[PDB]
Design brief:
Chain lengths: 135, 204, 155, 141
RNA sequence: CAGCUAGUUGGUGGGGUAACGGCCUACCAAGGCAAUGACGUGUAGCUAUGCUGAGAAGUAGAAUAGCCACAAUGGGACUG
RNA sequence: AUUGGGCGUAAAGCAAGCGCAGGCGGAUUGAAAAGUCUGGUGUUAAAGGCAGCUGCUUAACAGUUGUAUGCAUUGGAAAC
RNA sequence: CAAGGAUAGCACCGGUGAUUGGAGUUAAGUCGUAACAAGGUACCCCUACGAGAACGUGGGGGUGGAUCACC
RNA sequence: CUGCCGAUAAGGUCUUCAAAA
């Protein structure tokens, strides 16, 4: 605009928001305060398994899950794989992501880590799904 | 740490290790890209990225280098004075294992690496244990001794076929070298200068 | 040896009473790598005929380019529509640091060392247009001598 | 020398002249007039020594209260000017003060930069020679 | 987040502090700061520097190094 | 988007005016020297940054010498 | 002199809450057909009232309106 | 010369390519 105008009211930068907000909240429990500390991936416990329908082009039945994380945020997380051992009550170790078919899902469950089983009958891209090398 | 199928990568690009031993072979005289999908159309018009990466592999497969080593050497040579297009060619050709094969004391380049790794070589006044030392023209890289009697010295002692940039001085095995290699001794297998700009994008 | 390199192959189409008339358009840059370069854009039902006509048009319009020590003498901004391309002198050794349409024009002209930046749009026609306007407005240090009544550029 | 028209000028003395030269170049006009100030006279004197304009004459009234400079541009035989583009540095508001180390070189010395350090307006080359810098009025190339 | 500040502003004599000082005291006054952002809220140890950027600068204040602050929480003092 | 963007039809000219503080501002002369420019001195801890070299089989790394930035003071320049 | 304790009323901030308001997102739900052509009553802006709903009408304002036309 | 005149389930192809003769 003009030098005089910018000296009075400087240039305020637009902000930046994350894509996986629920993974950066830590509850201390001893004081019951939530701080914003970034963490790559977080552990949670599922509450409700089921199916959802993709947006428009896609047509299928995708398995979602309502997992409550160590914090106090409830997020619907897609189970990336063919077949699950979730039994409404289980523990899962969520990661980042964003499935485009289901609106609202922005997290993925890391497969084959804790209570959740690996994805057997897979020889391609195993390192991501978690299957022991056939050897 | 290297590939065990040098024929496959040499046959695709088209250029061998400069004697065509891996291209002539004893069978089928194959000059097609390997795999079932070798005899197809859509041959030319590789994008600049495509041809640069294929060519970049050619340079770093001719000498047995890992790309990370390449980034290190490029970062070293890049900053100095100016258009250093005469230095990095000498630097890339200054590898100790490269000079020993060009010394004429090994049947193949990577076989020379094994002899280097096994300690059968001495530098000017010290020994060699790592096949990555950067040499400078003037060092009497005298050959070892306990290796002149091994059942493989025959082709090794036939160094009469040698490039002019190395004054091997056989028998006495003085093993010196000078007169840095011109582009003539670096044949058209890899002769280009826009790989520097490719690494300029990838390496600061 | 006027080499030629396709810089873009778009797929334009009009609509008729049922169906879509589809014709390919090519943007070829022809250059002798000594100071002569032209551009030609042509449309045809098939790629071969389009390429022939585009090269013919490009060869019909060849401009003259001056090089100083292999690089560009002075910084210049080429403007064409909403595309603005910045050209900068470079020391002998950097190489062509250009990319895309700008890189093709500079290589085909003869220039070696060159700093470039597309400050505007990413439409190939405007990038080539901007590069050529910037290169054509360049002033030699002898034309200004006739103008300034100096001593052949001498301080 | 007589005129018939009123002579006006802008309050900013560098860009006033800059508009006159650029408009005259753009409109193919040759002779223009404006009111005279010592800075504008000085920038025009170094300008005519470097050869961008042909003549530059400042005039005064018969009462000694007003002075107006009427300058003409140096066109070649084919009627294309010698000036190509003008751009001002020490804009109003933001005064440009540069030491010697950041003294600009316009088009690798092809153009001239006007710098009034301590002895009136002064060219970039002689500023480098004296190794002293200061106010930079405008870029002319 | 538009008023805030009553030892807050100043003088006097005295006391106290390694030292100057409303640091403290008795008296005399009503000032001081504030739209060029006081005050309030939220946040945070600061810096040399680390990563990034052609540059202007953006970003974190790893390690280590300077300064400050703290030693379960909140106060007081001895020795020196 | 200071360097480095825009506001007719794409986001963006307040419905218009009187207007204090702020920003900008005709020509000439004199002085001062606050900006501006320059010389000398002090300082800007060390490590890190960049250059050269040495030492580890070369490197990574370590050491080594060089390498600015700003502030204050003093002496001049007088074009804005 | 004074940490702390008890009593007392203001100030700021957070969580939760029966019930309720709208909002977004959703392959193939129901009632109309308001807008894009003169969209079949030209459209749009402000405003007041009214109606299942899009919206209708009154007042002012615009062409970012079609047709029309002139030798 | 101005009656009346409302609606139309979802997702979808089709350009393979100029290296050249
Ligand atoms: Mg029809
Ligand atoms: Mg007092
Ligand atoms: Mg940048
Ligand atoms: Mg630290
Ligand atoms: Mg720490
Ligand atoms: Mg914009
Ligand atoms: Mg608008
Ligand atoms: Mg208006
Ligand atoms: Mg308006
Ligand atoms: Mg007025
Ligand atoms: Mg005023
Ligand atoms: Mg004035
Ligand atoms: Mg230091
Ligand atoms: Mg070190
Ligand atoms: Mg219906
Ligand atoms: Mg309708
Ligand atoms: Mg109707
Ligand atoms: Mg209607
Ligand atoms: Mg009803
Ligand atoms: Mg009604
Ligand atoms: Mg109405
Ligand atoms: Mg109306
Ligand atoms: Mg009106
Ligand atoms: Mg009817």
């Amino acid at each position: 605009a003009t030098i005089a105008q910018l000296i009075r009211k400087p240039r305020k930068k637009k902000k930046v928001k994350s894509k996986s907000p629920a993974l950066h909240y830590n509850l201390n429990l001893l004081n019951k305060k939530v701080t914003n500390v970034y963490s790559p991936l977080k552990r949670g416990v599922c509450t409700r398994v089921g199916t959802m329908t993709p947006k428009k082009p896609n047509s299928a039945l995708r398995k979602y899950a309502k997992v409550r994380l160590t914090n106090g945020f409830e997020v619907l997380t897609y189970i990336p794989g063919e077949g699950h051992n979730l039994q409404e009550h289980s523990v899962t170790l969520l990661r980042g992501g964003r499935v485009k078919d289901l609106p609202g899902v922005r997290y993925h469950i890391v497969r084959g880590t804790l209570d959740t089983v690996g994805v057997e009958k897979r020889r391609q891209q195993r390192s991501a799904y978690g299957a022991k090398k056939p050897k | 740490k290297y590939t065990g199928s040098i024929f496959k990568r040499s046959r695709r690009l088209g250029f061998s290790l400069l004697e065509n031993n891996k291209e002539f072979s004893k069978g089928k005289k194959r000059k097609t890209i390997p795999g079932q999908h070798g005899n197809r159309f859509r041959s030319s018009t590789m994008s600049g990225y495509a041809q640069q990466l294929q060519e970049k592999q050619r340079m770093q497969y001719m000498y047995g280098i890992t790309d990370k080593q390449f980034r290190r050497l490029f970062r070293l040579v890049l900053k100095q004075r100016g258009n250093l297009a005469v230095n990095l060619f000498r630097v890339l050709e200054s590898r100790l294992d490269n000079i020993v094969y060009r010394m004429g004391f090994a049947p193949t380049r990577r076989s020379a690496r094994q002899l280097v790794n096994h300690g059968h070589v001495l530098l000017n006044d010290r020994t060699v244990d790592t096949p990555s030392i950067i040499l400078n023209p003037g060092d009497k890289v005298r050959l070892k001794a306990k290796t002149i009697k091994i059942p493989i010295v025959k082709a090794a002692s036939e160094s009469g076929v040698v490039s002019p940039f190395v004054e091997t001085n056989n028998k006495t095995f003085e093993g010196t070298y000078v007169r840095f290699p011109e582009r003539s001794e670096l044949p058209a297998g890899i002769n280009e200068s826009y790989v520097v700009e490719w690494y300029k994008r990838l390496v600061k | 040896e006027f080499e030629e390199r396709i810089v873009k192959l778009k797929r334009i189409s009009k609509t008729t009473k049922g169906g879509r008339n589809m014709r390919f358009s090519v943007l070829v840059v022809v250059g002798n790598r000594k100071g002569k370069i032209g551009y030609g854009i042509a449309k045809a039902l098939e790629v071969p005929n389009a390429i022939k006509k585009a090269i013919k048009a490009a060869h019909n319009s060849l401009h003259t380019i001056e090089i100083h020590k292999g690089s560009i003498y002075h910084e210049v901004i080429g403007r064409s529509g909403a595309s603005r391309v910045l050209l900068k002198p470079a020391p002998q050794g950097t190489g062509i640091i250009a990319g895309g349409a700008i890189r093709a024009i500079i290589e085909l002209a003869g220039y070696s060392d060159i700093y470039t930046k597309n400050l505007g749009r990413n439409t190939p026609i405007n990038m080539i247009h901007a590069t050529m306007d910037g290169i054509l407005k360049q002033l030699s240090p002898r034309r200004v001598a006739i103008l300034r009544n100096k001593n052949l550029n001498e301080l | 020398i007589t005129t018939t028209k009123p002579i006006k000028a802008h309050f900013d003395p560098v860009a006033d002249l800059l508009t006159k030269i650029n408009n005259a170049r753009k409109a193919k006009l040759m002779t223009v007039t404006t009111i005279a100030s010592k800075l504008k006279i000085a920038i025009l004197e170094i300008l005519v020594k470097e050869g961008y304009l042909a003549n530059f004459q400042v005039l005064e009234n018969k009462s000694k209260t007003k002075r107006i400079v009427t300058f003409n541009l140096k066109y070649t035989q084919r009627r294309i000017p010698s000036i190509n583009g003008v751009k001002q540095i020490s804009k109003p508001g933001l005064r440009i003060y540069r030491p010697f180390e950041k003294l600009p070189l316009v088009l690798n010395g092809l153009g001239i930069a006007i710098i009034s350090t301590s002895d009136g307006v002064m060219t970039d080359k002689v500023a480098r020679l004296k190794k002293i810098g200061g106010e930079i009025l405008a870029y002319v190339w």
